[PDB]
Write a protein that binds this ligand. Structure first.
Ligand SMILES: Nc1ncnc2c1ncn2[C@@H]1O[C@H](COP(=O)(O)OP(=O)(O)OP(O)(O)=S)[C@@H](O)[C@H]1O
Ligand SMILES: [Zn+2]
Length: 555
């Protein structure tokens, strides 16, 4: 025709076609920010019946998307303040003019589809009303943002990222950032091997969601504000050998500090508090290099992502790779004679540009991604864990296999293998279909009763021995005030060592799914750092000595 697709662009067309030939449900394609997303929109539209509508929420992403589409030598329309086979509209402008969209429409593409949470469902109702079989494809460079969840639920590689509540049931294609860089479709990123002054944010604890707080951050900074223009110095140095420098501070009160730097008119701080009549006095100044330094709160973008950008200075710690790969990618575009984008990583971010995304909040700040094979389906999950020097698993915090599979009878389901269990994952209802009781409610019931003991567990000690019937292992749970409660396990018969693995190791192990190797009770004491202790123990006076009836783990 008029254009030629790259081998990865046909896969995204071919994947979107094979999906809509099978399923009527929406889908999403994950794409980098230098991928050439207009070429997929154009081929999909070349093969379409009726019309194709390319929505977007922010206006400049519409106008820019259209500029990128027509720049292919093709004809299309626009809907904003400003009838064709393809239309480029914005949610707000399209939602008041539904009278122009009454013909056949076979595809609706939603650019930056992660932003469907911030109207739009009025278009989805109208279109779906004229076109009952309208197909929905969304596009995005970030399908996951910490504190918001995921956009899709099922990934075509075989795992599960969200749940029934996700907007898009499926992600049918993903273009890795590693790939794009490997084959030159993207500028290569160089990290300054080591910087002499960075910050240290280990003395910080994320909130419940997983994101650090506006308060907690400017308090770790002030304690080191004596290290800041020693940093901007390094940043200042080679920021003369680059046409564009983007900086991401920890916040606004971190920008004002790091805004200067250079008394430029300007270095011109973008933030989430200006139009769009201001986004505009510096869009077109930065995209034209007026104005070289650009600092951000930030999220942020989704403009000012200009090809000429060739230096990324990380002035905030990244909680998830998705945000690090999101930042670093803002400046990986292709530009005439731009051999690389250098990344100056202050502030304690690892060199993990291709690390997998566990997609859950870390927890312990020293956690890292570890991979555990599912004993049922063999799917290799990525959980939060802690490894030693040689890459050996010490602990992992996954609870259920995240893989899924489908039968030739259409039925699709997630692997029901539980790494942490009562009789299913922590929840309200399985038989143990009775309403499950709550750990707090069970503690309260046993506190309110004598012949019962409820001790906060501070640790446990193991002892072993034997007699004419083989060995045994005695475990003793103790208080921070010396309160004891014990239980004993015989390890002699196969029905006895089997129960021991069933009743004591699977709940107490730190790497469930990975079995403990042992021959005698001695091999179990050797590895007692592989075992954790309950958080609460509940015991009933059944014999005149205390007997254990409940252990509470991960409270
Ligand atoms: N299929 C293609 N064939 C030839 N050149 C391409 C193709 N796709 C992209 N390019 C070129 O590579 C550069 C990167 O693509 P862009 O046009 O920036 O993609 P875009 O859709 O504008 O933005 P995204 O986020 O990457 S989809 C562009 O300047 C194009 O000239
Ligand atoms: Zn599994």
């Amino acid at each position: 025709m008029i254009f030629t697709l790259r081998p990865y662009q046909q896969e995204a067309v071919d994947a979107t076609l094979n999906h809509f030939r099978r399923h009527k449900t929406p889908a999403v394609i994950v794409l980098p920010t230098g991928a050439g997303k207009s070429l997929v929109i154009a081929e999909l539209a070349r093969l379409a019946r009726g019309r194709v509508l390319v929505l977007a929420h922010v206006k400049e992403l519409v106008a820019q998307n259209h500029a990128k589409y027509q720049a292919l030598g093709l004809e299309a329309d626009i809907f904003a303040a400003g009838h064709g086979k393809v239309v480029f509209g914005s949610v707000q402008s399209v939602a008041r003019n539904l009278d122009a969209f009454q013909g056949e429409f076979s595809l609706l593409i939603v650019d930056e589809c992660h932003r469907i949470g911030d109207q739009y469902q009025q278009i989805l109702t109208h279109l779906t009303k004229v076109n009952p079989h309208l197909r929905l494809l969304g596009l995005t460079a970030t399908p996951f943002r910490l504190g918001k969840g995921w956009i899709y639920q099922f990934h075509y590689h075989g795992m599960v990222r969200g749940d029934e509540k996700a907007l898009f049931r499926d992600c049918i294609y993903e273009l890795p950032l590693r790939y794009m860089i490997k084959h030159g479709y993207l500028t290569p990123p160089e990290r300054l091997d080591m910087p002499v002054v960075q910050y240290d944010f280990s003395r910080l604890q994320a909130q419940s969601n997983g994101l650090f707080s506006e308060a907690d951050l400017n308090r770790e900074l002030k304690k080191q504000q004596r290290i800041t223009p020693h940093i901007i110095s390094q940043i200042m140095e080679f920021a003369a050998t680059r046409k564009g420098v983007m900086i991401f501070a920890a916040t606004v009160e971190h920008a004002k500090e790091i805004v200067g730097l250079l008394p430029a008119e300007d270095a011109a701080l973008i933030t989430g508090d200006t139009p769009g009549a201001e986004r505009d006095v510096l869009i077109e100044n930065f995209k034209a290099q007026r104005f070289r330094y650009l600092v951000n709160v930030a999220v942020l973008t989704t403009g000012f992502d200009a090809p000429h950008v060739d230096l990324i200075a990380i002035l905030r710690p990244t909680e998830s790779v998705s945000l690090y790969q999101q930042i670093v990618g803002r400046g990986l575009r292709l530009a005439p004679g731009k051999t690389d984008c250098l990344i100056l990583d202050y502030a304690g971010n690892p060199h993990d540009l291709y690390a997998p995304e566990v997609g859950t909040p870390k927890g312990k700040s020293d956690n890292v991604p570890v991979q555990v094979f599912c004993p049922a389906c063999g799917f290799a999950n990525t959980f939060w864990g802690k490894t030693t020097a040689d890459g050996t698993l010490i602990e992992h915090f996954g609870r259920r296999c995240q893989g899924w599979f489908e039968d030739d009878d259409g039925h699709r389901e997630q692997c029901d293998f539980r790494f942490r269990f009562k009789n299913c994952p922590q929840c309200n209802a399985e038989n143990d279909d009775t309403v499950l009781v709550d750990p707090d409610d069970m503690l309260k019931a046993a506190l309110r009763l004598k012949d019962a003991l409820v001790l906060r567990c501070s640790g446990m000690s193991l002892q072993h021995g034997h007699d004419e019937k083989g060995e045994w292992l005695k475990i003793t749970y103790y208080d921070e005030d010396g309160a004891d409660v014990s239980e004993r396990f015989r390890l002699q018969t196969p029905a006895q060592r089997t129960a021991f693995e069933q009743l004591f190791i699977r709940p107490h192990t730190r790497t469930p799914g990975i079995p403990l190797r042992w021959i005698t009770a001695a091999d179990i004491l050797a590895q007692q750092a592989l075992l954790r202790h309950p958080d609460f123990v509940v015991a009933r006076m059944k014999g005149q000595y205390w007997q254990v009836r409940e252990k509470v783990f991960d409270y």
